[PDB]
Amino acid sequence: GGSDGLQDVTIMNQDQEQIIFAFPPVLGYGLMYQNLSSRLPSYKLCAFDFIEEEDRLDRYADLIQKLQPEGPLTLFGYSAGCSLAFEAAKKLEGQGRIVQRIIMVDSYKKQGVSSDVEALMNVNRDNEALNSEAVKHGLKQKTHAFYSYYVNLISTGQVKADIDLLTSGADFDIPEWLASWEEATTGAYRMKRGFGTHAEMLQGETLDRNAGILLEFLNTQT
Amino acid sequence: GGSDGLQDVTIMNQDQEQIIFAFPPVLGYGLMYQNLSSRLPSYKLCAFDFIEEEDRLDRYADLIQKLQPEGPLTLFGYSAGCSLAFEAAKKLEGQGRIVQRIIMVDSYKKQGVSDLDGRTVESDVEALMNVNRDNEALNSEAVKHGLKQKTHAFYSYYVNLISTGQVKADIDLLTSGADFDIPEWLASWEEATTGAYRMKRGFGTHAEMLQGETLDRNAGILLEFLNTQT
């Protein structure tokens, strides 16, 4: 608390009812999903920034409990945000919440300590959004912190939530320190090939193409 | 069809409206799905036998067009039947039909000729007929009179098959509870479809998935696949 409870989160499409909790790419800022939000008009997006503190999972769970206290949860991630979303899902399920699904955009499960940081940094070298006073101050440190978290992370266990993965239009060979999400869920693991290279999937013209597939994932039911 | 237009098909849950076209396990007889049919009461199963002739794909296409002239198609396969379903789906989409989805049960895409190590088709066939030596579906002089020949033909087909291309249909895969490392001559169905590829871990070993109590649990997942809308 103190200054505000909505610390580290940006709400988009605020008049919608269905909520998606989105974890940021490696740069660390949820504002990077502003354009994606315009392509998911029927969904309210609670876009998180990367929380650097060691108890970040407790903080995210607390924010989610406040933003959507009841009902099944839908999480989303892109880049390093995919691993963070997986870790947040385990945290939430361990608290007794039901996570219906996690939507992942072209990133895999961390299997060992030992990458798209420079590409993403190059993309937004001169991005107005990340130029505000609030961001400029902590941008360098937040990106470094998220990068450090990702490289050292080793994700274990499973979630019950279904996992949907939108893969890049380009070919990719899974590294030894990475793995598919197949064994990471006792639910259904679904994937569909999208458009563009990893670093451009949620921006420009490829975004329009990819948003359509993300809506297919979201509009799925049994 | 000759004197029997439905010689290579067995219809189950005949009073139902929604149809599932099912391709048989390597033994080659659709009747082996009788137990499964009781767990999918809302679907009419048109279970095919393995057609030994080289124009089998055209024959399957003809039968499906006859059994369901219009509307999206749903195909199903288990074991080697998964490969046949994929090959049949390609044929069907080529004819303008819409294949909504293909449900696969613990089997992968052929990427090359199967490596039988120090074994032979002959010995593997004898074994495949032993794993199911006690199965009521394999009774009757009908199946017994040609079980060997049909299993040999289907296994030979499977071993030498190399599947290429893609389908637009979504592909759902139910995997067995037993661990497994995909061999060099096999591949996941990921690149085989321009649609969505979905998989879920099921129960039991490969050979016990569609029988006994294991069937009861796995059927629940298959129903999840079938009841999917978007």
Swiss-Prot record, chain A:
Region (Thioesterase): 18-222
Domain of life: Bacteria
Location of the active site: S79, D106, H198
Functional description taken from the UniProt entry: Probably activates a leucine.
Family: Belongs to the ATP-dependent AMP-binding enzyme family.
Protein's UniProt name: Surfactin synthase subunit 3
Species the sequence originates in: Bacillus subtilis (strain 168)
Name of the gene encoding the protein in the UniProt record: srfAC
Full protein stretch here: 1042 to 1271 of 1275
